[PDB]
Each structure stands twice: as C-alpha cells, then as structure tokens.
Design an enzyme around this catalytic site. Structure first.
Site, mmCIF file in Angstrom:
data_model
loop_
_atom_site.group_PDB
_atom_site.id
_atom_site.type_symbol
_atom_site.label_atom_id
_atom_site.label_comp_id
_atom_site.label_asym_id
_atom_site.label_seq_id
_atom_site.Cartn_x
_atom_site.Cartn_y
_atom_site.Cartn_z
ATOM 1 N N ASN A 154 -2.713 1.972 13.170
ATOM 2 C CA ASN A 154 -2.760 3.412 12.249
ATOM 3 C C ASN A 154 -3.790 3.407 11.458
ATOM 4 O O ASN A 154 -4.380 3.360 10.435
ATOM 5 C CB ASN A 154 -1.592 3.839 11.723
ATOM 6 N N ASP B 134 5.948 2.730 5.408
ATOM 7 C CA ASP B 134 6.072 1.562 5.932
ATOM 8 C C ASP B 134 6.553 0.519 4.625
ATOM 9 O O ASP B 134 6.706 0.222 5.301
ATOM 10 C CB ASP B 134 5.643 0.704 7.199
ATOM 11 N N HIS C 221 1.057 -1.185 0.441
ATOM 12 C CA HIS C 221 -0.403 0.070 0.267
ATOM 13 C C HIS C 221 1.196 1.296 0.084
ATOM 14 O O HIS C 221 2.045 1.059 0.310
ATOM 15 C CB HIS C 221 -1.506 0.206 1.311
ATOM 16 N N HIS D 149 1.826 4.306 2.004
ATOM 17 C CA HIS D 149 1.994 4.738 3.585
ATOM 18 C C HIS D 149 4.071 4.460 3.666
ATOM 19 O O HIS D 149 4.184 3.567 2.348
ATOM 20 C CB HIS D 149 1.531 4.133 4.266
ATOM 21 N N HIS E 258 -6.529 -1.785 6.113
ATOM 22 C CA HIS E 258 -6.361 -0.585 6.109
ATOM 23 C C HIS E 258 -5.988 0.510 6.044
ATOM 24 O O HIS E 258 -5.900 1.516 6.128
ATOM 25 C CB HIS E 258 -4.732 -1.755 6.744
HETATM 26 C C1 LIG Z 1 3.343 4.963 8.169
HETATM 27 C C2 LIG Z 1 2.022 4.646 8.955
HETATM 28 C C3 LIG Z 1 2.439 4.562 10.450
HETATM 29 C C4 LIG Z 1 3.031 5.539 11.549
HETATM 30 C C5 LIG Z 1 3.097 4.767 12.810
HETATM 31 C C6 LIG Z 1 2.817 3.786 13.438
HETATM 32 C C7 LIG Z 1 2.264 3.211 12.580
HETATM 33 C C8 LIG Z 1 0.696 1.493 12.625
HETATM 34 C C9 LIG Z 1 1.213 0.937 13.981
HETATM 35 C C10 LIG Z 1 0.274 1.401 14.824
HETATM 36 C C11 LIG Z 1 0.470 0.777 16.137
HETATM 37 C C12 LIG Z 1 -0.275 -0.588 16.721
HETATM 38 C C13 LIG Z 1 0.622 -1.684 17.623
HETATM 39 S S1 LIG Z 1 -1.539 -1.353 17.650
HETATM 40 C C14 LIG Z 1 -1.708 -3.138 16.241
HETATM 41 O O1 LIG Z 1 -2.033 -2.888 18.377
HETATM 42 O O2 LIG Z 1 -1.911 -0.396 17.842
HETATM 43 C C15 LIG Z 1 0.556 -1.605 14.817
HETATM 44 F F1 LIG Z 1 1.130 -2.716 15.027
HETATM 45 C C16 LIG Z 1 1.052 -0.630 14.256
HETATM 46 C C17 LIG Z 1 0.455 1.535 11.199
HETATM 47 C C18 LIG Z 1 -0.155 -0.122 10.992
HETATM 48 O O3 LIG Z 1 -1.177 -0.018 11.572
HETATM 49 O O4 LIG Z 1 -0.043 -0.454 9.863
HETATM 50 N N1 LIG Z 1 1.254 2.335 10.365
HETATM 51 C C19 LIG Z 1 1.545 3.147 10.857
HETATM 52 N N2 LIG Z 1 1.180 5.332 8.225
HETATM 53 C C20 LIG Z 1 1.213 6.776 7.974
HETATM 54 C C21 LIG Z 1 0.156 7.382 8.692
HETATM 55 C C22 LIG Z 1 -0.381 8.525 7.735
HETATM 56 C C23 LIG Z 1 -1.459 8.783 6.445
HETATM 57 C C24 LIG Z 1 -1.902 9.923 6.466
HETATM 58 N N3 LIG Z 1 -2.996 10.290 5.067
HETATM 59 O O5 LIG Z 1 -0.751 5.940 8.122
HETATM 60 C C25 LIG Z 1 -0.098 4.833 8.502
HETATM 61 O O6 LIG Z 1 -0.740 4.194 8.633
HETATM 62 ZN ZN LIG Z 2 -0.397 1.935 6.181
HETATM 63 ZN ZN LIG Z 3 1.320 -0.303 8.539
#
Ligand SMILES: C[C@@H](c1cccc2c(-c3ccc(CS(C)(=O)=O)c(F)c3)c(C(=O)O)[nH]c12)N1CC(CCCN)OC1=O
Ligand SMILES: [Zn+2]
Ligand SMILES: [Zn+2]
Length: 232
Positions: A181, A89, A85, A87, A150
């Site tokens: 996220n 990461d 996707h 993002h 997601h």
């Molecule tokens: C770069 C990415 C992003 C950054 C920081 C953290 C994550 C997380 C994340 C968070 C918490 C947990 C632990 S838990 C399931 O126990 O909560 C986890 F496993 C993953 C994820 C995801 O969940 O994949 N990805 C993140 N970004 C940036 C973004 C902004 C888009 C604005 N348009 O959106 C996104 O996904």
């Molecule tokens: Zn993502």
């Molecule tokens: Zn992610």
C-alpha cells in the site's frame, strides 16, 4: 505447527505468536481492508520481567486478542508499546493498550499524522528521531529513523541481543510483487532509506517485514528492487 503463520491459519480476530530468538517473538494477525484480507506483523521483546510491544495487531479486537495470547504464551505484562508509523496496522488498538495499562509511544511525526488521519494516537512522543539516520534506545531495542519510505514517519527497530531487524512496513517480504500500500509512500526516497538501513545494521540475522514472512538481509535488497520497479 511450527511454520510462520499465514491467513490460512489466521482468521480475522485471532492472533498467533512466533518465536524469533531468545526473548523475541513476532505477532501475526489478519484484517480486512477495502474488501480484501491481509496479514500483518508486530514484535514482542522481553524487557526483564516485562514486555515491550512493537505495533498493534491492526484493530481493537485483534489487539485485545493479542494481549490474551501474550498472557497465555508468555505470561509477562506488556508495559510499553511503540508504533512504527501512523497507519491502522500500527496504531489501531492503541486505545485497547492504553486501557490495559500499557504506555504507548510514537514519534511526534507519527502522532501528528495519526491525529490528522483519524487514527488512534499513542500517548507519548519519542524525540530524537526526526532526522534520517537518527537512533535512540528504548528498553531492549534501538529505534532508527531511516528516512521516508512506506511513509514519511516509518521507524525500524533493532534488537541488539539477537541481531533481529524489524523493518516494519518499510521492508517487504521476499515473495512481494509490488510495494504494497503506497498511499503515503515516497517511492523515490525509499531506496535511499533502505540503503541507510543496510548500512546501519549489517549484522542483522533475521529481518522481519511489516507484512509477511521473515527472512535474512535479502529482504532489504528485494524491497529496494520492488519499489524501484513500482516507481517505474
Ligand atoms: C492499513 C494500511 C494497509 C491497508 C491494506 C493493505 C496494506 C498493505 C499491504 C498490501 C499488500 C501487500 C502484499 S504485496 C507487498 O505483495 O503488495 C502487503 F504486504 C501489504 C500495507 C503495507 O504495504 O504496509 N499496508 C496496508 N494502510 C492504509 C492506508 C491508507 C492511508 C491513506 N492516507 O495506507 C496503508 O498502508
Ligand atoms: Zn502503512
Ligand atoms: Zn503496513
């Protein structure tokens, strides 16, 4: 020393590989985002005498470190990469890959979203994935579009030789307490998308989430459960 790695073993900037099955590894790196540190996974699949990479290591320097780690541990060239996707990461590091000889791919949806977000943009479009339930072959994997979860563009990857299901960020680890996220998520469609994955890949033996520990098929139901409670 053998367990699946975590941040406490992964300084930001370092990459570890983990053998999943014959010719299948995950890659694990960590990154800072909004003042917190997170792990993230990708996949490496042996493709004859070459390697297929799934997802970057979340940033340019992490992705350079990934390529070095692959050369050290595996020693076969990465020729193609797919980002699952838009993002950072998943695509942050695509410019590094492209300057290291790697052909980078993503769906047209991912490419449009990455461009609009200001993220790095894979070079080549993957057609044939625009409707939920679509699948296409890409070297030693199958790419599958389950529907919005997601993100609206998220792809999952199946390695049929090993029954490995790489869920990407549409699938969470068993310890997760919320749906991660959710900025770009569709919490209402996500369970339906997960059900599509469960129906399409009932013989998966290993399930790898986008972040955290691999496990078995239970990751899929757990994901549905945490997302439903997040929506509610
Ligand atoms: C770069 C990415 C992003 C950054 C920081 C953290 C994550 C997380 C994340 C968070 C918490 C947990 C632990 S838990 C399931 O126990 O909560 C986890 F496993 C993953 C994820 C995801 O969940 O994949 N990805 C993140 N970004 C940036 C973004 C902004 C888009 C604005 N348009 O959106 C996104 O996904
Ligand atoms: Zn993502
Ligand atoms: Zn992610």
């Amino acid at each position: 020393s053998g367990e699946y790695p975590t941040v406490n073993e992964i300084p930001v900037g370092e990459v570890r590989l983990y053998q999943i099955a014959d010719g299948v590894w995950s890659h694990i790196a960590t990154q800072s985002f909004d003042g917190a540190v997170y792990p993230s996974n990708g996949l490496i699949v042996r493709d004859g005498d070459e390697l297929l990479l799934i997802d970057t290591a979340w940033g340019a320097k992490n992705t350079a470190a990934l390529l070095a780690e692959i050369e050290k541990q595996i020693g076969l060239p990465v020729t193609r990469a797919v980002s699952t996707h838009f993002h950072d990461d998943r695509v942050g590091g695509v410019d590094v890959l492209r300057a290291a000889g790697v052909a980078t791919y993503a769906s047209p949806s991912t490419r449009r979203l990455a461009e609009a977000e200001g993220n790095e943009i894979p070079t080549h479009s993957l057609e044939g994935l625009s409707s939920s339930g679509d699948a296409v072959r890409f070297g030693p994997v199958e790419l599958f579009y389950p529907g919005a979860a997601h993100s609206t563009d998220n792809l999952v990857v199946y390695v049929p030789s090993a029954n490995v299901l790489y869920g990407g960020c549409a699938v969470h680890e068993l310890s997760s307490t919320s749906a991660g996220n959710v900025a770009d998520a569709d919490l209402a469609e996500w369970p339906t998308s997960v059900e599509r994955i469960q129906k399409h890949y009932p013989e998966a033996e290993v399930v790898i989430p986008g972040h955290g520990l691999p496990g078995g098929l239970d990751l899929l139901q757990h994901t549905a459960n945490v997302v439903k409670a997040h929506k509610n």
